[PDB]
Write a protein that binds this ligand. Sequence first.
Ligand code: SAH
Ligand code: SAH
Ligand code: CL
Ligand code: CL
Ligand code: NA
Ligand code: NA
Ligand code: NA
Ligand code: NA
Lengths: 337, 337
Amino acid sequence: GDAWQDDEYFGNYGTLRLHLEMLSDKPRTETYRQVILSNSAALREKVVLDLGCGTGVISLFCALLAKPAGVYAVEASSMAEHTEELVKQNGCDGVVTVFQERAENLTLPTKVDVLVSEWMGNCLLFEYMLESVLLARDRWLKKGGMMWPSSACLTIVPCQAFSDYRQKVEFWENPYGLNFSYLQSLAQKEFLSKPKFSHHLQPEDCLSTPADVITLDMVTIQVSDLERLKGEFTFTVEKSGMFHGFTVWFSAHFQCLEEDGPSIELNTGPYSEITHWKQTLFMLDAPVSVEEGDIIAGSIRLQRNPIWRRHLSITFLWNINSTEVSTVKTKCFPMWR
Amino acid sequence: GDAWQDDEYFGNYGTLRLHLEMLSDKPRTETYRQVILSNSAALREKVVLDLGCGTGVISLFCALLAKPAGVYAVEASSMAEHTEELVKQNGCDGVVTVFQERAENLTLPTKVDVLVSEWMGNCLLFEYMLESVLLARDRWLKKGGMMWPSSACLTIVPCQAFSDYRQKVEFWENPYGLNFSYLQSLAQKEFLSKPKFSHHLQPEDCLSTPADVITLDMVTIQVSDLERLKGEFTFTVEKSGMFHGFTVWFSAHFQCLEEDGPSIELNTGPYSEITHWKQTLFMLDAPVSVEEGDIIAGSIRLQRNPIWRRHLSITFLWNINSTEVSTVKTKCFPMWR
Ligand SMILES: Nc1ncnc2c1ncn2[C@@H]1O[C@H](CSCC[C@H](N)C(=O)O)[C@@H](O)[C@H]1O
Ligand SMILES: Nc1ncnc2c1ncn2[C@@H]1O[C@H](CSCC[C@H](N)C(=O)O)[C@@H](O)[C@H]1O
Ligand SMILES: [Cl-]
Ligand SMILES: [Cl-]
Ligand code: NA
Ligand code: NA
Ligand code: NA
Ligand code: NA
């Protein structure tokens, strides 16, 4: 409710702006289309729950690209009223049923064989729609049923971010020949203490090979596991450069309904086609130069905000060519836009 | 106060984000630098009022690139506390005095010879800082004194906007093969009823030569003139194309202090270097095809909001190859972000 900021959250999803962004994201939307196509024969006579269907696009993929026994399209925002009309104008109202309900207070006619949802936020967990997905899974997913995505993982890499640091911090040293360096302290707090959403990381700015640090198993994960997620990492710097911070993204995996089948992946990283999530940048307070062979090791922690339940803080701990504790640095980034 | 949303307006100018945007705007900031340089000798022993000085950059241009008798740097936001320190760290605290005051409640030691300000908003008038500038002019500018800018004008052109109309309106006809055309009515209201700030108009999308429609004389204009500004226009379409709407920008002119001197111009239009204002796009409800020789004539009206005094509505009236009144179309755009 108020702790979930549901008025603002679902109010935003009642306008076309966010849905235009999702549907204009071709890698994202086509991935879900490909999952339905790759599993078309296996979906026949299955009951599908599309949790948070928005405009209903995923439900329409299920009803038009396969032959399920039924599709339950669930959407809590005011968009559901239009989704019902869209389903009917695409000739699917006999298979797709629209429920204008929250997953938490959901009443469905039957349990389901497949629960498909697009719940991933920035750095995977932001806004914690995953909680709603897990609650609907526990109540409505039949034993042996399929979660789509079936697993997800958080991936990070040490990176260079020259343009960001120069434009936001070093800029103040001599703009037009004026000494504005007195503002650099304020610039570090205002521009570097928060994550930068919609960062486009270039491959040449990666200082090492990216590593998966946290992996979520969508069948076994529980709501209580989401309060604090942690992963260790150790990076060998592969090219000499400037360590400005960490870039974070995620992947989502869609297991085939049949063991012998194709598994489909949605990757939001720098080596894949850009998505509306792009990547997320976490700047250090001060950059440090590094050379090939340097070891950057530590951990990342995603700590859910105890009061504002759609928010979290991301804490990096890292050490460069060292194991001691007096050398360890840490920075905590509140995840707010 | 509340009708001026001063808490939010001056709160925004208390952070570095907006000042970084202004100072990173090289055409904007260098223009004011060039005005000071071009008038350096004429500014000697003059008293200068920098109204809304922000970080104090314009005041520092005056004290460092000329020899004025004194510079009054006035800033109502919390940035003024830092501006005072910036002035001192640039060795100008003997010439520049910082006043953390609103122009409306301003108490200066003397009247001034020059009133310089960067007050222009989107479509020139947005947020109506010009009102504050005119009130300070009436009280503090000596007779014969100089306003900088000394004049400004609003410029518009009929234009093509294919990408905007396709991405926001036509997109819904067949996304991924689905018929979402039922959403086009909602898309027209959500995406086309409001102005699009930060539009980058390309030269090849101009359907005619741009025309100045409203011109403001900064010495003679009065606050009461700002309630309703109107200008007529008539465009001969120079290339066959698609009439998607109107693009609007402005120019500001800086008269030399001496008659025989260079006059300097800041232009935010498509034939000039891009500024942080870019241009502003006003989309029609439905595009119309036009051919070379077609006449698009009508008027534009900037009507100040009577309640929310930093806002306005922009009303276009236009007619294509016609003089009658039953053929006239009109669209009113509320100026909100
Ligand atoms: N607890 C909940 N119950 C029902 N719907 C929810 C929900 N939490 C989020 N949603 C909805 O899930 C949607 C997430 S965005 C994805 C929309 C659509 N499935 C697509 O892929 O294009 C939003 O419309 C949001 O309103
Ligand atoms: N009525 C008023 N009194 C004092 N300052 C005002 C004002 N209205 C606007 N301002 C200030 O004027 C500034 C406008 S932006 C320009 C800042 C600076 N002169 C530069 O060119 O970089 C803001 O800092 C704003 O706070
Ligand atoms: Cl300078
Ligand atoms: Cl399809
Ligand atoms: Na409904
Ligand atoms: Na991976
Ligand atoms: Na002060
Ligand atoms: Na002009």
